[PDB]
Amino acid sequence: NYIERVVSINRVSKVVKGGRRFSFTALVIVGDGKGMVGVGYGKAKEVPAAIAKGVEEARKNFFRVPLIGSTITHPVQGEAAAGVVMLRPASPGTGVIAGGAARAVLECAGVHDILAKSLGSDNAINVVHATVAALKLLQRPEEVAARRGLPIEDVAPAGMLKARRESEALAAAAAREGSA
Amino acid sequence: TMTDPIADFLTRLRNANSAYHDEVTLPHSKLKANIAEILKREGYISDYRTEDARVGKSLVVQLKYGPSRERSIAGLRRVSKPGLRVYAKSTNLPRVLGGLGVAIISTSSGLLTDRQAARQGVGGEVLAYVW
Amino acid sequence: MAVVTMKQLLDSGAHFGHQTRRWNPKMKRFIFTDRNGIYIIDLQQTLTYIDKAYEFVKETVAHGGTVLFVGTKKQAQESIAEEATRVGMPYVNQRWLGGMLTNFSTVHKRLQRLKELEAMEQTGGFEGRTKKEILMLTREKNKLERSLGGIRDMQKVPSAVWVVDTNKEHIAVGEARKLGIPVIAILDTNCDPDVVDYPIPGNDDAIRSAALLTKVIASAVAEGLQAR
Amino acid sequence: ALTAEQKKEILGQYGLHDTDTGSPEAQVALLTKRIQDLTEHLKVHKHDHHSRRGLLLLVGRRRRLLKYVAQVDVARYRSLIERLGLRR
Amino acid sequence: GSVIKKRRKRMSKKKHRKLLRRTRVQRRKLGK
RNA sequence: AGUAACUGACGCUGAGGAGCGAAAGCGUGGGGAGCGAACAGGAUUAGAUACCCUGGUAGUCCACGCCGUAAACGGUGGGUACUAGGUGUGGGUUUCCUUCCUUGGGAUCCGUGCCGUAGCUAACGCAUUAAGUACCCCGCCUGGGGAGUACGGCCGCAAGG
RNA sequence: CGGCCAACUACGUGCCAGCAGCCGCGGUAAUACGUAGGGUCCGAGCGUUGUCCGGAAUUACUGGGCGUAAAGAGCUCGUAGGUGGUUUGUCGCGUUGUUCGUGAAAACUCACAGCUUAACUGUGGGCGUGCGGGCGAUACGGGCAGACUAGAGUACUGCAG
């Protein structure tokens, strides 16, 4: 039950003694819609073979995306070969305000109301890595309190707890209203 | 020559933290002594000590690392550098890591952090971010 | 818990291993002093990790964790040959052909070809053709039994904790780490201790320290083999 | 350069006590003696371009020291200039 | 870098000095 | 480099400004063995204003001035603090054995090389002599040609900058 | 009505006629040129021009760079300027809290009301990011009067070039 987003198809061709040696590459992203995404680069001689090989590589590169409700915790800015992305949280009811390659990763993780920007290279491959690096630089409310050796409320702000606390109650009741 | 001992206090800590050093020896000063107090209370370092040396005193800062050998400081940044002084009014204060990271602000009431200035309504000159 | 007596550790010697040109440590507890140009391995830090590793394998093997056999350096091959044969396990002596645990979709069919050729040989297909093919048939059979020996019984998505020749098979330990069940080794003093969760200080050239260490773990995994 | 006795004569006569060697009085008095000797050398070795640079690195220092005396005290700055014969 | 950029600028330099040489006496006339 | 005797922040950078600045080149006066732009022939070639060969003048040299530009390159501005090491080499100091010399080893200060972590880079690669981590001050960049050209101005005997 | 970019086929000529914001479509068979048939976006409106902002983090304070892509002056000395080791005493200029006066209406906000709804109109807060007074505060920068020796500079003894 993962949504799959193909973001690029490029036909690369090595030149050999008799001509060229064309081949295809794909950059599909696989995401579960709740905060686990992975990227995958599959190269093959045919596009349906390339899209497939990218997929099996993607499913094995999953990693948790720390969410509060349906939006990331704090502003962040990661980097890749030359890509720069500016993930920043937003209030509920905003939509995924992101560009070309950043949308695919963000809409596969399941973040819903986030602001982004692409401040560097505009490649499909590099921007995908840049947003992944920015998402890996993310923290958690209970994790930071663990590092600094303090109770949670002395570290994270009151508004951050309210949003986190509310998300528990809304998710819990709808879960027990569909299971019980 | 040296133009910002507050800056080298932070860059010694950043270099030493990345290299997994366990002690950092710095020249001692009243301003640097007070900053180390805030880092200890907010829980970013373990302990600090003011000893003596050939000509003056000396600060040693016992750094803290996690039980699985992970860092306790995600980074440090100097804000108000010489040649561009950054003062924050009491109603527009900076917010590091959204609300998780913390800042050090030098105001008339003493070296206070980000949350303390909001609870007391005073403002002053920003010094640095630690998160 | 020391199986070998404390005084006989002094008679055995624990101050060997390398010179001051190829030391690459990052821990200031594993450096005692510097004399003779040879660093001093601390016995206290050796026995602490020895007991911790002894307990961890004890918990692992009682529940049913597996560790397989490997070895390539010239002062450890003949040691494990006796131990493996007594315990019945096979061993690999020459080649950890790089990319064997990740590439089980290629080396598995090699185990099929051997069993296809072995079943071909048990049938008695000898002289229907030239003998050059059968000469190379036994050459690759011996090559496969020389390079891949312990893979005969597993069929169980292996667990790997043993590491041999850390420094010179530095990419053989990576291929284990892509699916990295925790690993142990006899510490090469030029190898970074932090990467391996149980860096056991030993000697990278001495057969006495090589054989005794793998004999201790071989006995430890044996008691858990008996008490299944 | 200056012999040890040549310096010891200038040092005592200009210094503020029987021990000083780094007072601004002592250094300006020493540098002025070195400069007057060097520019006597450059009057017959016109092309000594590398030794003229050493002359320039000393006059720059002497002006640097003289500026310190004038800042810390005007009376002691005038007393040094007149006793040595400089202009600024 | 590459030498093509240098011999691209070198030709404009070489051509211009030729122009000054050819018009050396005429320039000193209209310069009065 | 050693001793810390001496003053007690006197530091750093530095718009304009000033000095120094390979080679070629200019002026006045000397000098000129070899080498030699220009210039003659000889040869190769379809053609040789060239490579090759035989000759040869300014120059190359000295004294006093001028010019002020080079791939004037580590193509890397100056100062300061921190961040694993291994091996060479050039200066100055000293403990462990002493033959009582020194490549005996040990430690520390200052240069100069090769390799190699963390980190950085588009990559090549840099990596305690950073292109790593930070602070201060200056110069410079903003698509390629037109063009570092024209016009105006400053400097220069001129070439020209 | 190609990708951007919401919307595709037949027919008439084929380097012509033409289209065209960029890549680019027309060398007698085109989703891109005229013609019809369908389709999308709007709608008393729809397109093209001219101008500005945006995307352009493409003058970057927020928010960039200089080894090889454009970018470190050929190198030093130094004027104005910028910048400032440890510490004690003091002022309150910068900095900061509160208070008073202003910051005139409309405008853009928020709330409410009235035009049959809206456009439009009215009432009350917010704003008016600042300026001039009084009352504190003294952590930082700074002015003043001091104090140290770790920076910098002298001294003495050697040393290499």
Side-chain angles (χ1 to χ4, degrees):
Chain A
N1 209 341
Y2 312 100
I3 69 182
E4 287 149 36
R5 279 285 186 278
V6 167
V7 296
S8 69
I9 296 290
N10 203 25
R11 176 166 74 139
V12 295
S13 58
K14 179 220 288 198
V15 46
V16 83
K17 73 185 259 182
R20 280 86 158 129
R21 211 266 298 155
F22 294 63
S23 187
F24 291 84
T25 89
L27 194 62
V28 58
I29 304 73
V30 171
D32 84 278
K34 304 150 181 178
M36 280 227 191
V37 279
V39 317
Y41 195 24
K43 324 168 272 281
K45 207 155 280 178
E46 280 299 356
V47 200
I51 278 178
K53 303 293 291 143
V55 161
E56 304 123 303
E57 197 210 357
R59 195 169 273 127
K60 294 142 53 184
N61 291 168
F62 276 165
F63 69 106
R64 184 71 190 131
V65 177
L67 302 194
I68 286 327
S70 307
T71 295
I72 82 193
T73 280
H74 55 78
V76 80
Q77 175 166 304
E79 194 154 331
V84 191
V85 187
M86 192 285 298
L87 282 317
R88 165 162 179 183
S91 100
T94 307
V96 59
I97 316 291
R103 265 180 86 98
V105 184
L106 290 166
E107 89 173 324
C108 270
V111 315
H112 290 328
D113 310 320
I114 179 155
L115 297 179
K117 188 48 208 173
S118 158
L119 301 144
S121 146
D122 55 351
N123 262 318
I125 304 186
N126 273 352
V127 166
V128 155
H129 293 335
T131 178
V132 160
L135 282 165
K136 295 215 244 205
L137 206 172
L138 262 170
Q139 316 279 323
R140 335 186 74 93
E142 82 254 9
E143 180 198 33
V144 170
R147 267 168 20 203
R148 309 195 28 207
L150 299 164
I152 165 70
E153 88 260 6
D154 261 352
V155 172
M160 269 202 56
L161 271 283
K162 304 182 141 43
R164 192 175 98 96
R165 183 203 328 121
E166 291 206 10
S167 77
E168 314 317 298
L170 203 73
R176 75 178 56 211
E177 276 213 51
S179 91
Chain B
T1 71
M2 177 78 77
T3 71
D4 211 33
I6 285 293
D8 88 335
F9 174 85
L10 252 61
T11 190
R12 279 181 194 249
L13 262 160
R14 197 176 334 124
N15 294 347
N17 184 296
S18 80
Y20 290 92
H21 285 201
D22 229 311
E23 292 263 31
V24 187
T25 292
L26 318 93
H28 166 267
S29 273
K30 52 147 73 180
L31 197 55
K32 299 165 78 170
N34 269 309
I35 288 203
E37 172 96 350
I38 318 171
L39 276 177
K40 183 219 229 277
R41 281 174 62 257
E42 311 286 90
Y44 277 129
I45 43 154
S46 279
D47 213 350
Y48 76 118
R49 185 165 74 259
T50 280
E51 35 204 80
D52 67 276
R54 180 181 145 259
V55 293
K57 289 169 214 310
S58 192
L59 261 193
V60 306
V61 178
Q62 278 94 23
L63 264 59
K64 152 164 77 188
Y65 301 106
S68 79
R69 209 73 177 126
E70 70 290 355
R71 293 168 170 86
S72 162
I73 304 188
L76 311 97
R77 208 174 70 152
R78 178 68 201 276
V79 169
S80 176
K81 314 169 274 316
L84 211 168
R85 300 278 189 205
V86 176
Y87 311 101
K89 209 162 37 64
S90 154
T91 207
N92 54 31
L93 284 177
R95 284 303 191 265
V96 193
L97 261 193
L100 306 161
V102 75
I104 292 118
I105 291 172
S106 178
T107 170
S108 302
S109 322
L111 266 174
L112 297 200
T113 169
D114 166 14
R115 279 211 205 195
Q116 279 168 340
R119 292 305 283 219
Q120 287 164 36
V122 81
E125 141 172 87
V126 199
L127 273 188
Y129 300 169
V130 51
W131 71 91
Chain C
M1 182 92 52
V3 182
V4 174
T5 51
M6 41 230 68
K7 265 205 264 160
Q8 277 61 39
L9 308 176
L10 261 167
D11 277 345
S12 309
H15 308 156
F16 278 53
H18 226 314
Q19 213 160 312
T20 195
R21 69 181 187 272
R22 201 49 179 83
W23 69 308
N24 215 342
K26 210 47 205 85
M27 213 75 30
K28 269 68 189 167
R29 278 88 63 205
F30 305 143
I31 316 164
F32 187 46
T33 47
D34 195 85
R35 216 60 180 137
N36 312 69
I38 301 137
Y39 302 89
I40 319 300
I41 288 182
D42 196 67
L43 48 92
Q44 170 70 236
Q45 319 313 313
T46 300
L47 61 91
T48 49
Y49 287 78
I50 270 176
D51 205 6
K52 259 88 157 177
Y54 202 103
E55 303 158 285
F56 199 87
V57 75
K58 259 179 53 58
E59 308 142 13
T60 316
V61 305
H63 156 56
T66 169
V67 190
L68 266 283
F69 282 32
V70 72
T72 200
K73 48 188 296 290
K74 54 159 39 176
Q75 305 252 324
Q77 166 37 12
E78 297 148 40
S79 62
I80 53 192
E82 322 164 300
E83 169 256 5
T85 321
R86 295 322 166 269
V87 311
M89 212 56 247
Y91 63 84
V92 46
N93 60 336
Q94 220 61 256
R95 286 299 99 203
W96 183 320
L97 265 171
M100 73 153 199
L101 273 200
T102 79
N103 197 3
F104 202 63
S105 164
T106 301
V107 296
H108 146 76
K109 78 159 175 217
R110 284 308 263 192
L111 191 86
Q112 291 297 103
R113 187 184 290 275
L114 160 82
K115 87 150 192 50
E116 175 209 292
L117 290 191
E118 192 208 52
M120 206 203 68
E121 277 317 304
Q122 304 169 89
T123 302
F126 278 97
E127 276 215 272
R129 208 40 253 188
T130 178
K131 312 161 162 170
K132 177 59 205 321
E133 49 86 17
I134 207 65
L135 186 51
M136 268 323 94
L137 178 141
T138 325
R139 176 86 261 174
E140 315 321 310
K141 270 181 164 290
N142 284 266
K143 171 159 289 294
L144 206 75
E145 295 153 72
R146 178 181 181 181
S147 300
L148 282 154
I151 54 170
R152 313 302 195 206
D153 65 302
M154 85 71 91
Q155 63 104 40
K156 218 190 205 178
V157 58
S159 164
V161 176
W162 193 10
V163 181
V164 177
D165 188 40
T166 53
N167 214 336
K168 317 303 187 266
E169 290 263 322
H170 38 279
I171 322 191
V173 305
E175 300 264 0
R177 276 327 285 186
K178 302 297 190 294
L179 284 141
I181 286 94
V183 288
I184 71 143
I186 170 184
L187 170 147
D188 215 324
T189 202
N190 44 62
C191 178
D192 211 38
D194 297 76
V195 52
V196 284
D197 308 65
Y198 301 98
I200 315 292
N203 296 86
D204 50 299
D205 288 0
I207 175 176
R208 187 226 82 239
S209 160
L212 203 147
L213 264 293
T214 168
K215 185 51 203 77
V216 159
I217 190 68
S219 43
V221 306
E223 195 101 336
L225 269 164
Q226 150 205 326
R228 193 185 305 116
Chain D
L2 294 175
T3 41
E5 57 89 11
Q6 263 184 30
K7 283 149 68 126
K8 241 195 159 181
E9 159 185 304
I10 287 297
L11 272 200
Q13 194 253 329
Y14 269 78
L16 303 155
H17 49 91
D18 57 8
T19 326
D20 85 323
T21 36
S23 309
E25 270 71 4
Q27 300 199 76
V28 172
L30 277 168
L31 291 184
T32 309
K33 192 58 166 76
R34 289 182 43 79
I35 277 158
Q36 291 175 162
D37 284 7
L38 208 153
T39 179
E40 211 166 319
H41 158 57
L42 298 191
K43 246 166 185 179
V44 317
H45 287 81
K46 284 282 202 324
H47 285 330
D48 211 334
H49 286 135
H50 292 89
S51 313
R52 197 187 312 274
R53 176 168 190 263
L55 173 58
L56 251 177
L57 262 179
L58 293 172
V59 49
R61 173 181 318 305
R62 184 183 76 195
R63 183 209 295 116
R64 184 171 272 124
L65 279 157
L66 259 184
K67 189 166 297 170
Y68 173 59
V69 183
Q71 173 54 310
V72 86
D73 181 78
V74 283
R76 210 169 41 121
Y77 169 78
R78 268 76 160 282
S79 187
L80 194 54
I81 275 187
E82 170 271 359
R83 197 167 36 153
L84 279 158
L86 316 186
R87 66 190 315 273
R88 64 212 310 271
Chain E
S2 161
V3 196
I4 320 171
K5 309 204 291 287
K6 284 165 171 320
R7 48 182 281 126
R8 181 176 308 166
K9 296 194 180 304
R10 184 199 58 153
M11 192 55 158
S12 52
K13 178 136 185 153
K14 188 251 173 198
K15 278 319 209 187
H16 173 70
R17 314 267 293 123
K18 264 192 40 173
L19 204 73
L20 288 186
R21 181 51 137 104
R22 161 143 45 69
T23 78
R24 174 201 300 310
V25 186
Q26 270 107 329
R27 266 176 318 132
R28 314 211 221 201
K29 174 161 306 308
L30 69 97
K32 184 250 295 188

